[PDB]
Amino acid sequence: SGFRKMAFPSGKVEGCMVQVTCGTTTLNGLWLDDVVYCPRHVICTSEDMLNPNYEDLLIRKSNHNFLVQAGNVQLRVIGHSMQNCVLKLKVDTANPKTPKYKFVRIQPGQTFSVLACYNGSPSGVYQCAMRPNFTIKGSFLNGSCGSVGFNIDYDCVSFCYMHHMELPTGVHAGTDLEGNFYGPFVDRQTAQAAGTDTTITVNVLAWLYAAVINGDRWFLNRFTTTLNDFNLVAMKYNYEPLTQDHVDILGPLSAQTGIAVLDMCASLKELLQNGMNGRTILGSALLEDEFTPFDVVRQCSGVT
Amino acid sequence: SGFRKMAFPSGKVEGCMVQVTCGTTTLNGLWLDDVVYCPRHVICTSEDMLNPNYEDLLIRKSNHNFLVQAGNVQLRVIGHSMQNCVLKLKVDTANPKTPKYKFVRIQPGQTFSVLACYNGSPSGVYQCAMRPNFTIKGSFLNGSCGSVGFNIDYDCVSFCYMHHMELPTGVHAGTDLEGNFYGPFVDRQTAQAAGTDTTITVNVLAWLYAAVINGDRWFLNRFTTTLNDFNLVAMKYNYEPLTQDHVDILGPLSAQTGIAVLDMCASLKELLQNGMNGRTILGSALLEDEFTPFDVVRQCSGVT
Numbered sequence A, B: 001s002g003f004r005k006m007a008f009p010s011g012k013v014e015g016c017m018v019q020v021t022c023g024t025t026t027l028n029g030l031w032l033d034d035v036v037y038c039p040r041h042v043i044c045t046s047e048d049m050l051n052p053n054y055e056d057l058l059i060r061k062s063n064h065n066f067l068v069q070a071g072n073v074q075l076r077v078i079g080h081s082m083q084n085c086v087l088k089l090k091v092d093t094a095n096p097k098t099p100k101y102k103f104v105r106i107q108p109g110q111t112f113s114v115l116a117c118y119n120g121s122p123s124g125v126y127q128c129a130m131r132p133n134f135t136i137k138g139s140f141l142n143g144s145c146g147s148v149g150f151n152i153d154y155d156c157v158s159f160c161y162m163h164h165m166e167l168p169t170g171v172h173a174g175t176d177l178e179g180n181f182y183g184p185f186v187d188r189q190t191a192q193a194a195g196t197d198t199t200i201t202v203n204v205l206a207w208l209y210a211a212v213i214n215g216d217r218w219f220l221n222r223f224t225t226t227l228n229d230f231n232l233v234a235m236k237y238n239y240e241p242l243t244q245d246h247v248d249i250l251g252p253l254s255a256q257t258g259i260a261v262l263d264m265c266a267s268l269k270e271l272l273q274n275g276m277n278g279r280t281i282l283g284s285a286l287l288e289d290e291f292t293p294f295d296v297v298r299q300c301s302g303v304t
């Protein structure tokens, strides 16, 4: 077959997207059971975002100051509370389209599907990876806040991300479904910096395994390299260091293609030191790191 | 914001995917109203695919030889007919989740979202462009046949593609929802060739307009070029020729960024003649042509 960046089917997540309005600010919310989740900066006007005291701002707000809309139907808010940077709205109606769901906190290097929403209506879907500096490279316009990232395990939806803000470099930052920010960011219109972003090495190796599976084999040498010799070279080229845990995740991929992981590191070492010389790998002139080993096995088996 | 490859929300299409079994072959079908659509080679065994006579093969089949499954529920087939390369199954139950839909035949250069399915169950979603040689670059394993490509206009689903086969070069080919193949292909396990694939120039220019919008402006020169001088250079580098119709589609993008289309062609002319010198545009070391002018305005406005 081929290899493409693939997002999970967004059907179950679509039924949980609602519109949350507080004053003039409007963003998206997540309606699960009788609770609506949305970023807390919806209670902010344009001037509070520079330096907000969310404790004093939410104290002035009552239940009727929150307008929740599921389509053209208004939900009655009967309770509200603030958990970290996420504001929780209790409603009088349980969402009938609630799927089996979990609240998880992903780790750097893992991927998830993003459902970009505006005014509580789905607009598109794309796949995103959690960078080592806890940022993401998405597409988020005004009002996209409250859009959620998720994974799907057959019938269970693992919500893991909520969009909150954009950084000066154009990358995006957000929280989990418990309100805790990924990284050292705060929901305030101020100059915030992300760390030096590095390359997810275990994801590059998984992507190269997908290349060999699909036909692209010109980069395959027969040179070899120790796990330590590759790690010192990977640090020069701004790559995450490879641990034995990382080599075990690439195990199923190693035993299937007949390519030992240590030999895969040697081909990657040469590609990093000698460049690509204008060639392409899976239709790309750069080394992709947004494919986890799980994503490759996902696409090479059709988990459906 | 940022710029990403974005697929339409697959919620409405998910409710129309069923499993179609005939003998030992199993693929996916599209259940709209009381009709199920699926590729006709489901009536083929492994040996007929080399040289099938679908007229004689379907004549031996009756209604009860077709097993249609919507989840764990069996649909009763009460009628069947063959329209070009698509086999149509009339069922006794109208799909309650049928959205407002149309059957369209897209043109080369236009894009659509692909919902990859296996055994009638959705697996993932990604965006695909119709190459000038009427092929697509997707991800399709065994049993993925019957997966459909579609566009969404607010509440209307425009079905336009159905997957049928893979070519020797690894690219994929299929039909519209009327059974007519895109290109000069036939549903038979034989050596088939696609034409020389060329680059969709109007899509590259739209992608460069999205780059200027998002910050990437290093490629912006102030050189100029006539529509004819660019077309003769575009033919050397295997690019589609630009017509006045193409310049009109880039109009809204031209009047918004203050960059005339003729100046955009000059910057593209230099990028084609002088390379990229190791730089990147929107995080890519190649010129992307899978973004139509409509897709760029779609993402720069949030059509939702």
Ligand SMILES: *C(=N)[C@H](C[C@@H]1CCNC1=O)NC(=O)[C@H](CC(C)C)NC(=O)c1ccc(-c2ccc(OC)nc2)cc1
Binding pocket: A027, A041, A044, A049, A140, A141, A142, A143, A144, A145, A164, A165, A166, A167, A168, A172, A186, A187, A188, A189, A190, A191, A192, B001
């Ligand atoms: C939510 N609807 C919106 C989505 C943002 C806006 C457009 N694209 C996005 O990703 N989020 C916001 O408006 C939030 C609201 C705060 C209260 C959390 N803020 C930002 O997204 C944001 C903050 C700061 C800056 C910024 C950039 C450079 C700079 O230089 C000194 N200073 C500040 C940008 C955006």
Ligand SMILES: *C(=N)[C@H](C[C@@H]1CCNC1=O)NC(=O)[C@H](CC(C)C)NC(=O)c1ccc(-c2ccc(OC)nc2)cc1
Binding pocket: A001, B027, B041, B044, B049, B140, B141, B142, B143, B144, B145, B164, B165, B166, B167, B168, B172, B186, B187, B188, B189, B190, B191, B192
């Ligand atoms: C449908 N489930 C399946 C999807 C294909 C298989 C795996 N990936 C895909 O995209 N489609 C098929 O099995 C169809 C069935 C026919 C009857 C339409 N066939 C092919 O996909 C197919 C035909 C021919 C060749 C081929 C390649 C090289 C070659 O060299 C001489 N000769 C033939 C490959 C695949």
